[PDB]
Write a protein that binds this DNA or RNA. Structure first.
Lengths: 250, 709, 742
RNA sequence: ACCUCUGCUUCUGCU
RNA sequence: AGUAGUAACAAGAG
């Protein structure tokens, strides 16, 4: 249980009258508003800014916590991070070298269930790895701009229905009033609960991946021949206006 | 007057929760006192059943600890209620009821729905059985002591007593004040959306009407009621014929040359303004293993090889820019050479008097307050400088010729890609051996990489060393046809102060570049440069003089950024020509890459009209055409500004009109001189725009002649 | 032998090589200094095109109002705003008859959307004019300042949650005799010092209760801020753009939503449809408009451009459009749709930073703000500015703004103006003459198709279209428009030549490093290449080359060259160590000095997934550490989505999925306190998310307090924790003791 | 001059 | 000086 810690934090917050009035005057609806309150400003030229930022000493912001503190201040003369804190994260700012240090000498985390979480992406790779390629021919190709399914799905649903399913899988206590969907997809829900049981990956990341394999992406593309998603995902390699490439997916 | 009754009989907590509940169903407490009462009663009965009871540490019911027997789900917000209900269901390993319960019994592990009826309890009991089945226990009460509970109801006798007592007590009080009829007599009002306009907005709307209307009410009824048929036809009948689109059928003779002033010799010929030398460049080559190294170390080793040039302290001034100081510039050059030659790691230059001058130290105006400025009569709004008007310069054609030409060197730094598997990938790799090679060997490509790598390091220095003057070498890594690598040193540059906040903020960059070009041969090209003669080199058999082109220059974060991205010039050119290869491949049924470039057993090498030689068309190879487009795209970056943007966009209209003529599609025009006006105002002092205007006119001439045949 | 690059067009038709006419390897143009000069031009021009209409004074704001609608018809070909209401209504009636049920369906859907729309919808409006501080702010912060300020004036509609009751408060706020609000004030403080004088005068910024009159507030609520547009391609000279305040945003969403529903069902609209769906729709339309050509006739196509598009369109006409479109809707919604046109009809333009004056001799410079624009003899301005300011006077307000009743600001009613454009296209014919027109519309850009018996009759039809559009306030550019026989044309920079051709240069800047982060940019980079292969005719050779170019840009941008290279740098030093330490080097990401694995066949697969089974276990454990300090608190849009000027990308969350530091310039400004304000909100929201784990994924809903929700959740969590044996009596008693105080 | 902060962070008023 | 081009930067703030 983390319950008692939460309560102590809540009591802590209410000592600060500013935070107290916020929690009192702000409706649950209005959480969605104050969540997005910050000094930041939508960057109109990110490509420029990034090339500029990557030339500064400490362009990154760390999460405040113990894991951040495991990164040393410096490493063999290199300043990995600074004592000055980021306005947003309130944690130390750091160099891009800090990322490289972490990936070289940082703590070795647990990746159990990773392949089950990103099962969707690994199935792409498996379809490619096990595919066989036929001939490539040159000649005119008549392409028609059709709406087609870009990615194969576990089970296609409307966005709403999929969202409800994801609530039953990840956040059952907050799922609200039961739906017909909960019953129809009960076997899907059960199976995902099993697969995602041990993972320490953030629930929001899990929600994103569940969304990729439930919510269809149907877009207009110039296509010829098969329009099945296991072909469309490879469409860039299958054909042009002037050529054909035979492809047998795995 | 029930609202008074409700306030006196029910607690404040109960009434608030009941009002909140009505708000969630979007219903007005003040217009529906009956509903407010029923929800108050229902909520209280739930609390009556709960208030007294608790559980001890062994799970046995007693009466008064902090763990009540009942969880009161009714009375709180939906989202919290469902949170509570699902938390309970999940924790106790039971199904979640599809409707929202009123109570939960921790001892019974059962959800409970509570009902209050004026009629028979049995009737109300079985109207709930239809909907809840038996997901919940039922507790139905009535005002006259009647009641119906489910068989395994958790309600103890004493609680049942309090509920019925409280209900009858209320029944008495209501009928005593003649309020029972208000509860019985139907109460129902239709709920419309509430959006109404106050005074100000209504007044603003009244003065937002078109002429011919007194107020908004007038416009609304007018639009709702009248049939405007025939209005368009009527207005066109009285609209002046002077209002017309003035159509003119286009002919070749209507298309005069664009920008005739570029031929006017009374104007100065457009000078060289690029950030670095191009065809006039000269790289001091130094062979290496082929791997990377500190830029200072590279320059140091090149200058050690060419020590006679490095040690030259007594040069010959050949040409001098109008406002340049040749002493300061030379001193700065020596400072650069001496700094790069030394043993130290630092490439920082001292803020000397000659370096302060060259980098524009302290030249920004002082900000004073507006009050002082307003009272100062001498302070005015400057007239804006306009780009000068220039004529064609021969050097732009020369640059295009030389940059399009093949060399023995390759400078591209293209990294690895995973090995091919699909036939398409093999095809792509085989095609690249023609396309990429053709470009990699041409002069333009090496110049590109010089720009790319310099802007890369200049951007970094600009952020990392804002307060320091710094010497940055101008370099390349080059590979000959034998596979031997060389580090190239084209010169040294000095970065000034660079506190670049705004993306257009300028960092002054003083460039010192080597060249074999004598600036006196074509002096119109070099008014911006101060050139020294510093030595000689045995290029082949005979000597060539080595000059040092010195220039105070400048750039910003944006220009540096797009410089780092200039490699994409490859894609724009390669995409265009590969498209043609694919079209050709489609016709004959096989990969036509070799056939296009070099020719085939069954195919002549693809040729393109490439240029002119004393009046006549000259044909060129497929590869030449590729290199010309690549060079063209590189010039777009090097000479890119608003003048080029405007010229390209507006002239593209004439291009598409000329195509319509060539296709015999009978194009029409509505204001040709207006169209020309849009093009010609973009022709000022951009070397590439001016030259493009010249080329446009030349090309237009050939298309006119071809129309006859 | 002299090379001429235009000679390429001798061998290749211009459409087929149109990509080479777009110089998109060059820098786009940026503005420097003030935009006041451009904004004043817009004010002058907009009034110039309408000054033959009715001039009067607003009794609400006291501003100078100009109304061209139902004004005298033009007698020249200059830009005309003199639209005739009856002609607009007739055009809409024709659209209504041509599309039965569409107007009521569009109104129906737009209304029902509004009914379920919440206030937080206004947080995604990008930069927004904030009336409390008279500066542009992020939408969320501007929305927040307005809600909190409204609470000081007995306006609490926002608490109900819906957009309607918040919009009710917005129009009701215009009736308040005074509006009280929070705003930062720079208060001088004389602090005891240590030097001789023993005092130093600082200037401290602290929030304060401020108030303004009813009229002052109305003017701010009607105001739009202005600035110069940057990075706009294909134009020599700069132009002004505007930013709307928070009051009008809610009303504009509904009207554009309404217009969007209509546009989606018009065969002529090239909007909102985009990409391949646009290409398909338009080429189908061209086929039909060509097939209908009478046998032995002539079909022509006008590559169209409208001049002073926004400057001539009038709010009063847009008010007429909503009224006509919402004919069968309930009054409340009809009134709701009328608000945005009304507010625009009474809009006020803030004129920007003002002008800078200087002394070249003394090397001094000073910014003269817009209020003090005339606090100086006009002789001291330059020639062009002097003339502007003279023409500005009749519309100038002493507080430094300008009345601007007529005209629209650049691209505010995009959809609705498209509907007006299509309305003109839908007339088709005048006086039963022997021609028919039709076409394509997309804001200012149009393409007119005309079928007739001969080409002279086609030109008559084009002249009639030109003249018809005048009656709607639509002005066709005669300078930039041209015409030719059907078969080839241009439209929204799409080039048609017996079918739309590729224009690879248009997308070229998107191939670069996007600047989201190392992880995202790799995925974005390969995806762009992949999509251009499919859509924009990029062959395998160019595509493979594009992979190479990107990695090059990627490696230099993020300073992550290969571990076996000898390039130097802070990160590179550690990358080289990682190289030596690692066995499975092919498993190393490019960002970690690893080899590029990408080719054509695997562009669609995330890098970490491609290399996963090649990775050293200790490396992948570090790279994918679930509690790593680099990723931080995510949103489902922050993991998946990115902008392009939105596209989604597939990338595995890892240590490279980091975020840049916050811009720190605010530390030195009078906006300091927003840091504390932010960090306060953040603490409350972070703890809320601890209590409610689904908050990040699905929007929390409720009109009850944030505190109430958290309290009840923690009470239940504790109660069930105790009974399940996860909490001892000691903990449960303390837990309930704490909650008791709350 | 010395020290501190800033490199897209907005300036109507407080001035 | 120079960058640049209808107005700016060539450091700003305390």
């Amino acid at each position: 249980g983390m319950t008692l810690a939460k309560i102590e934090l809540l009591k802590q917050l209410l000592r600060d009258n500013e935070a107290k009035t916020v929690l009192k005057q702000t409706t649950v609806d209005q959480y969605n508003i104050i969540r997005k309150f910050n000094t930041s400003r939508i960057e109109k030229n990110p490509s420029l800014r990034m090339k500029w930022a990557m030339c500064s000493n400490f362009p990154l912001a760390l999460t405040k916590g113990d894991m951040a503190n495991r990164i040393p201040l410096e490493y063999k003369g290199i300043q990995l991070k600074t004592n000055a804190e980021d306005i947003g994260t309130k944690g130390q700012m750091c160099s891009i070298a800090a990322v490289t240090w972490w990936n070289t000498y940082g703590p070795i985390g647990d990746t159990e269930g990773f392949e089950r979480v990103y099962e969707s992406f690994f199935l792409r790779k498996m379809r490619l790895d096990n595919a066989t390629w036929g001939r490539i021919t040159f000649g005119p190709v008549e392409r028609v701009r059709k709406r087609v399914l870009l990615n194969p799905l576990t089970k296609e649903m409307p966005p709403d229905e999929a969202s409800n399913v994801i609530m039953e899988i990840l956040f059952p206590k907050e799922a609200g009033i039961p739906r017909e969907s909960t019953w129809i997809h009960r076997e899907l829900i059960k199976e995902k609960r099993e697969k995602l049981k041990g993972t320490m990956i953030t629930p929001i990341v899990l929600a994103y991946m569940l969304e990729r394999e439930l919510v269809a992406r149907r877009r207009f593309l110039p296509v010829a021949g098969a329009t099945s998603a296991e072909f469309i995902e490879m469409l860039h390699c299958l054909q042009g206006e002037n050529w054909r490439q035979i492809y047998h997916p795995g | 007057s029930m609202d008074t009754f409700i306030t006196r009989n029910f607690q404040t907590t109960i009434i608030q929760k009941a009002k909140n509940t009505m708000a969630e169903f979007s219903e007005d407490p003040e217009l529906q006192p009956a509903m407010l009462f029923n929800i108050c009663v229902h909520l209280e009965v739930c609390y009556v059943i709960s208030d007294m009871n608790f559980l001890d540490e062994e799970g046995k019911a007693y009466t008064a600890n902090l763990r009540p027997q009942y969880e009161v789900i009714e009375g709180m917000p939906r989202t919290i209620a469902w949170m509570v209900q699902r938390s309970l269901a999940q924790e106790h390993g039971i199904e979640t009821p599809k409707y929202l319960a009123d109570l939960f019994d921790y001892k019974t592990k059962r959800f409970i729905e509570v009902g209050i009826t004026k009629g028979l309890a049995d009737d109300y009991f079985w109207k709930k059985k239809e909907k809840l089945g038996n997901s919940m226990e039922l507790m139905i009460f009535s005002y006259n002591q009647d009641y119906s509970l489910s068989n395994e109801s958790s309600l103890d006798e004493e609680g049942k007593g309090r509920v019925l007592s409280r209900l009858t007590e209320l029944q008495a009080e209501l009928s005593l004040k003649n309020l029972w009829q208000v509860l019985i007599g139907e109460e129902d009002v239709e709920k419309g959306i509430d959006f109404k306009l106050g005074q100000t907005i209504s007044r603003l709307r009244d003065i937002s009407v078109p002429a011919g209307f007194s107020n908004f009410e007038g416009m609304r009824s007018y639009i709702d009621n009248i049939d405007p048929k025939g209005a368009i036809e009527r207005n066109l009948a009285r609209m002046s014929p002077l209002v017309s689109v003035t159509p003119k059928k286009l002919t070749w003779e209507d298309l005069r040359p664009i920008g005739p002033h570029i031929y006017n010799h009374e104007l100065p010929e457009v000078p060289y303004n690029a950030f670095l030398l191009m065809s006039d460049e000269l790289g001091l080559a130094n062979m290496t293993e082929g791997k990377s190294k500190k830029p200072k170390t590279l320059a140091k080793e090149c200058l050690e090889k060419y020590s006679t040039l490095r040690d030259q302290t007594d040069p010959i001034l050949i040409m001098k820019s109008e406002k340049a100081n040749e002493n300061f510039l030379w001193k700065l050059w020596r400072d650069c050479v001496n700094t790069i030659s030394n043993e130290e790691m630092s490439n920082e230059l001292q803020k000397t008097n000659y370096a302060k001058w060259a980098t524009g130290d302290g030249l920004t105006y002082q900000k004073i307050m507006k009050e002082v400025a307003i009272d100062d009569e001498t302070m005015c709004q400057e007239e804006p400088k306009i780009p000068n008007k220039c004529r064609v310069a021969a050097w732009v054609q020369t640059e295009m010729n030389l940059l399009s030409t093949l060399t023995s060197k390759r400078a591209l730094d293209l990294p690895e890609i995973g090995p091919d598997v699909a036939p398409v990938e093999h095809v792509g790799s085989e095609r690249r051996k023609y396309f990429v090679n053709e470009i990699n060997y041409c002069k333009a490509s090496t110049v590109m990489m010089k720009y790319v790598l310099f802007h890369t390091s200049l951007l970094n220095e600009s952020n990392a060393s804002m307060g320091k003057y710094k010497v940055i070498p101008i370099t390349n890594r080059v590979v000959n046809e034998k596979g031997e690598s060389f580090d190239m040193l084209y010169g040294l540059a000095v970065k000034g102060q660079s506190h670049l906040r705004g993306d257009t903020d300028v960092v002054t960059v003083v460039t010192f570049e080597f060249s074999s070009t004598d600036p006196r041969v074509d002096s119109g090209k070099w008014p911006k440069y101060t050139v020294f003669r510093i030595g000689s080199l045995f290029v082949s058999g005979r000597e060539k003089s080595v000059y040092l082109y010195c220039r105070v220059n400048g750039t910003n974060k944006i220009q540096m950024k797009w410089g780092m991205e200039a490699r994409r010039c490859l894609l724009q050119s390669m995409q265009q020509m590969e498209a043609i290869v694919e079209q050709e491949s489609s016709i004959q049924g096989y990969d036509m890459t070799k056939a296009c470039f070099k020719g085939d057993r069954v195919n002549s090498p693809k040729t393109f009209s490439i240029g002119t030689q004393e009046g006549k068309l000259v044909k060129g190879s497929f590869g030449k055409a590729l290199r010309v487009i690549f060079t063209k795209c590189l010039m777009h970056y090097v000479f890119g500004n608003a003048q080029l943007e405007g010229f390209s966009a507006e002239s593209r209209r004439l291009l598409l009109l000329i195509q319509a003529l060539k296709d015999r599609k009978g194009p029409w025009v509505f204001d040709l001189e207006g169209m020309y006006s849009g093009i010609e105002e973009c022709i000022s002092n951009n070397p590439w725009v001016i030259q493009s205007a010249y080329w446009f006119n030349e090309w237009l001439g050939f298309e006119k002649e071809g129309s006859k045949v | 032998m002299n090379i001429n690059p235009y000679f390429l067009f001798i061998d290749v038709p211009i459409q087929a090589a149109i990509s080479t006419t777009f110089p998109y390897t060059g820098v786009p143009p940026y503005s420097h200094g003030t935009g006041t000069g451009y904004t004043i031009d817009t004010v002058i021009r907009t009034h110039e095109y309408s000054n033959k209409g009715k001039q009067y004074i607003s009794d609400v704001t006291g501003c100078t109002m100009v109304d061209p609608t139902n004004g005298p018809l033009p007698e020249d070909n200059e830009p005309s705003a003199y639209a005739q209401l009856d002609c607009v209504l007739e055009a809409l009636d024709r659209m209504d008859e041509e599309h039965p049920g569409l107007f009521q369906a569009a109104s129906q859907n737009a209304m029902e959307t509004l009914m379920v729309t919440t206030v937080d919808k206004l947080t995604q409006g990008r930069q927004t004019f904030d009336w409390t501080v008279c500066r542009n702010q992020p939408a969320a912060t501007a929305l927040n300042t307005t809600i909190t300020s409204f609470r000081l004036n007995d306006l609490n509609g926002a608490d109900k949650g819906g957009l309607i009751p918040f919009c009710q408060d917005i129009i009701d706020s215009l009736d308040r005799p005074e509006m009280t609000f929070f705003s930062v004030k720079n208060i001088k403080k004389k602090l005891p010092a240590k030097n001789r004088k023993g005092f130093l005068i600082k200037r401290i910024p602290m929030k304060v209760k401020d108030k303004i009159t009813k009229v002052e507030y109305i003017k701010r609520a009607l105001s739009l801020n202005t600035m110069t547009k940057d990075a706009e391609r294909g134009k020599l000279k700069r132009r002004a753009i505007a930013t709307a305040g928070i009051q009008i945003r809610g009303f504009v969403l509904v009207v554009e939503n309404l217009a969007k529903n209509i546009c989606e069902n018009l065969e002529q609209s090239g909007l909102p449809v985009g990409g391949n769906e646009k290409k398909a729709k338009l080429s189908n339309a061209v086929a039909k408009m060509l097939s209908n050509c009478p046998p032995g006739g002539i079909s022509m196509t006008v590559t169209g451009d409208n001049t002073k598009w926004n400057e001539c369109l009038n709010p009063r006409i847009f008010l007429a459009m909503t009224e006509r479109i919402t004919r069968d809707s309930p009054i409340w919604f009809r009134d709701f749709c009328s608000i945005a046109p009304v507010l625009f009809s009474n809009k006020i333009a803030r004129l920007g930073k003002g002008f800078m004056i200087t002394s070249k001799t003394k090397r001094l410079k000073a910014q003269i703000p817009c209020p003090d624009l005339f606090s100086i003899p006009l002789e001291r301005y330059n020639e062009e500015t002097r003339a502007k300011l003279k023409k500005l006077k009749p519309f100038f307000n002493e507080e430094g703004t300008a009345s601007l009743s007529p005209g629209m600001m650049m691209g505010m009613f995009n959809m609705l103006s498209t509907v007006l454009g299509v309305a003109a296209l839908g007339i088709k014919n005048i006086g039963n003459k022997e021609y028919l027109w039709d076409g394509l519309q997309s804001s200012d850009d149009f393409a007119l198709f005309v079928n007739a018996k001969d080409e002279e009759t086609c030109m008559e039809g084009i002249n009639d279209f030109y003249r018809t559009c005048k009656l709607l306030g639509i002005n066709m550019s005669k300078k930039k428009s041209y015409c030719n026989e059907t078969g080839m044309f241009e439209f929204t920079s799409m080039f048609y030549r017996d079918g739309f051709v590729s224009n690879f240069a248009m997308e070229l800047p998107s191939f670069g490093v996007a600047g989201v982060n190392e992880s995202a940019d790799m995925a974005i980079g390969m995806t762009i290449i992949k999509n251009n292969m499919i859509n924009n005719g990029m062959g395998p050779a160019t595509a493979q080359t594009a992979i190479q170019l990107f990695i090059a840009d990627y490696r230099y941008t993020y300073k992550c060259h290969r571990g076996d290279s000898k390039v130097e740098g802070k990160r590179m030093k550690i990358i080289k160590e990682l190289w030596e330490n690692t066995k499975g080097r092919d498993g190393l990401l490019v960002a970690d000095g690893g080899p590029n694995i990408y080719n054509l066949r695997n562009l669609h697969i995330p890098e970490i997934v491609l290399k996963y089974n090649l990775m050293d276990p200790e490396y992948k454990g570090r790279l994918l550490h679930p509690q790593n300090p680099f990723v931080g608190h995510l949103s489902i849009e922050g993991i998946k989505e990115a902008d392009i000027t939105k596209m989604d990308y597939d990338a595995v969350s890892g240590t490279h999925s980091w975020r840049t530091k916050r811009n720190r310039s605010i530390l030195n400004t009078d906006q300091r306190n927003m840091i504390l304000e932010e960090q306060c909100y953040a603490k409350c929201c972070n703890l809320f998310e601890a209590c409610f784990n689904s908050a990040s994924y699905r929007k929390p809903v409720g009109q009850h307090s944030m505190l109430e929700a958290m309290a009840h959740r923690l009470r239940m969590d504790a109660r069930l924790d105790y009974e399940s044996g996860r909490m001892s009596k000691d903990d449960f008693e303390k837990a309930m003791a704490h909650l008791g105080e709350i």
